[PDB]
Structure 1
């Protein structure tokens, strides 16, 4: 907290700049004045620049720490439930009973989506990727919910939020049902947030569906563990679109697409096939399928991580949840020996050891969801669905900030003024 006093800069003149500090994490040099002075930095990507102050989530990557409103991710995972984590993320404090009661009633109150929005799904191809259908529908909500689009009105945000929060799962489960040809399942108030999702995902009218408390709690954990992850590509996208005035539904729609981005990204995308396909306990085990690794696309298959140095703090609760489920679903797991085998190769192969392609939270989330009969295409959908509450919090915090439409500068390197004379006559 010492040098936090101040510091200066100067190329042709003297400028005194303060050194701000956070409640956690390193200091920052407030350059909020250099602009006027006539001084501008150059940071493509905002790697050495801090774009905001936040009180939502704290991450210390080198130390594998993740906090949501101060609360460690591990405790919330085992001790809380998704809805309560939502409240905490959006409000900043654990909810009293009465507070959580109302929060849950409001949410349960608007889970249904306008029948006309439901008509939109039928205009997509049955062969479309459920993630693309997810972005499509979310990006159309504004044409149906035009009464809560003014982001300058607080009540507006309040409403828009509950709408996205209550309806995202109804929407995600519809994408799945449309992709496999089964009828849509309405939201039920008698079920939990997780139970209800499983219900809407798997029940048919041919027999009452019964949710296994084990798989349910497992889903609840998959959700809490993806609720929010500090600043990153998709959240920065939601923050930028937001401060540009864009309505809340459009902001979340862009967030979902940013989150999907790495996936239909190419080299990534093709290695996705290699995993979901090759696996005959001859390839994966004898490092055959892994004998091919030109394209890394590791974190995509659940290996390694960009922020956390040695391990993903969220992976602890999930691995134990994964163990549990795999046993609850009894002996119907033969091919899923590659699960045990890949983890082994991830922790015991010098390469992975050296390059640190350690199993992150998604490795186990993926194993859990698969064991449940959920197709891969629905993986990002469920993560985006869960991440929506975090996007709302960040978006709600970007507004409440100072509504300062961010306008970065550019270092113009192009052509100096030149006269124009077309070479065409058509």
Structure 2
């Protein structure tokens, strides 16, 4: 049965031809305009990325190769005895657009495990970093330290052909993906625990290797990570973490430097911690209501929060007109595993009245929860109470879609991303000349 590298070798030439003929026939077609407020407004609305792994359906949520959360919950292969999609199977879907079989996912998990041993200098690196250095910083440092193992950088120095870039980018990505759970758990044990790694199962999967190394054998925890590491794998290419990895990778930096740069973007307060903003808001609410989760008191809090000018975290989106299927997938996990959890009961009571209050308030366009509203409660139930570590888990997941688009970029020979820049003075002179000609 064909491996992931072999099926991609058969599909990637087709995609390259289709792109080449698509631009050759429609390249001069104008698709958008650039207003002065957009370039001064963070390129909002400007199409500036080609991302094949996932697209946000305004009605059905995120679609991984056209398949929704509901579709991937049924079509994707799973671990034996588990109803949760394996993140390795979605990575196969993101790279090839085709749903793999059971033996293909099982062999991919074994290949990753064979690439999971950290080099000695990386272990000595992480074991000497101080605990007051943020875990996300240790994450990007460890990834960067793996650059000495880069098969693409060494092949580029020897002088390989341009059509062979994808092969070495593929190998570096899988060597890198196999070590992410080990790095994330090594950081967790060193900073927040005693630094002792858990026992390793040779036939373990991606998410299971993360949980066991963190130090838990609970299979419900392993199933939570399989769910978590899947639904956070990819979400278009406009966000800072994905855009950064494509931008750095477009200069032919190895997947290590490209992912490390993306992780630094994910480490930003405005990107990879909406999960934690919700958790802080729930704890502040939980202290005010003194653990009264009735409809009458919760609505009063939501009205007081909205009337004062504040927003309800996790609720509200600019495009998605429906509730995120990633949110409901976590609610289903909670009701199936810990329905009486005090923190989940608070999330549910808010889910039962917040869409009605926000609609009645009339200041939120799409008053529906997203994945970040329900992610923290599940992690808290299994001991992951340190919010500073959540962005590391986000990176362990988002690296799948990041490295998927990176392998596709090298396969089709994507060009370096270089936009045009001006100063405010030169933008003024440009505006003056444009408006003068009318």
Coarse TM-score class (shorter-chain normalised): 0.7 to 0.9
Higher RCO, 1 or 2 (CA under 8 Å, sep at least 6)?
2
1:48 shift after superposition: 4.5
Give the structure 2 partner of residue 15 of structure 1: none
Equivalent residue for 2:373, pick from 363, 385, 402: 363
Give the structure 2 partner of residue 193 of structure 1: 206
Distance 1:165 1:415, change over 3 A: closer
Per-residue deviation, residues 16-44 of structure 1 (Å, max 9, x unmatched): xxxxx99xxxxx9744899xxxx998652
TM-score, scaled to structure 2: 0.73
Given that residues 279 and 289 in structure 1 are in contact (C-alpha distance below 8 angstroms), is that contact kept between their aligned partners in structure 2? no
Given that residues 316 and 369 in structure 2 are in contact (C-alpha distance below 8 angstroms), is that contact kept between their aligned partners in structure 1? yes
Distance 1:131 1:239, change over 3 A: same
Per-residue deviation, residues 272-297 of structure 1 (Å, max 9, x unmatched): 64544552362675358754576857
Cα distance in 1 between the residues matched to 2:274 and 2:108: 43
Equivalent residue for 1:55, pick from 46, 52, 55: 52
Cα distance in 1 between the residues matched to 2:214 and 2:204: 13
Give the structure 1 partner of residue 117 of structure 2: 112
CA RMSD across the alignment: 3.6
1:157 shift after superposition: 0.5
Cα distance in 1 between the residues matched to 2:51 and 2:342: 46
1:267 shift after superposition: 12
1:397 shift after superposition: 2.1
Distance 1:215 1:385, change over 3 A: same
Give the structure 1 partner of residue 407 of structure 2: 396
2:93 corresponds to 1:123:
no
Please, which runs of 5 or more residues in structure 2 have no aligned partner?
Answer: 1-17, 20-24, 77-85, 157-161, 428-438
Cα distance in 2 between the residues matched to 1:108 and 1:269: 30
Give the structure 2 partner of residue 6 of structure 1: none
Please, which runs of 5 or more residues in structure 1 have no aligned partner?
Answer: 1-20, 23-27, 204-209, 417-426
Equivalent residue for 1:229, pick from 215, 230, 235: 235
Give the structure 1 partner of residue 14 of structure 2: none
Cα distance in 2 between the residues matched to 1:296 and 1:138: 38
**Match runs of 1:221-300 below 5 Å:** 221-233=227-239, 234-262=241-269, 273-277=280-284, 279-280=286-287, 282=289, 285=293, 286-287=297-298, 291-292=304-305, 296=310, 298=312
**Match runs of 1:9-408 below 5 Å:** 30-31=27-28, 44=39, 45-61=42-58, 63-80=59-76, 81-142=86-147, 144-149=148-153, 153-182=165-194, 183-185=196-198, 187-203=200-216, 210-212=217-219, 214-233=220-239, 234-262=241-269, 273-277=280-284, 279-280=286-287, 282=289, 285=293, 286-287=297-298, 291-292=304-305, 296=310, 298=312, 301-327=313-339, 333-334=341-342, 336-350=344-358, 354=362, 355=364, 356-375=366-385, 376-408=387-419
Moved more, 144-153 or 129-138: 144-153
Cα distance in 2 between the residues matched to 1:255 and 1:51: 17
Given that residues 197 and 213 in structure 2 are in contact (C-alpha distance below 8 angstroms), is that contact kept between their aligned partners in structure 1? yes
TM-score, scaled to structure 1: 0.75
Given that residues 238 and 391 in structure 1 are in contact (C-alpha distance below 8 angstroms), is that contact kept between their aligned partners in structure 2? yes
Cα distance in 2 between the residues matched to 1:352 and 1:307: 20
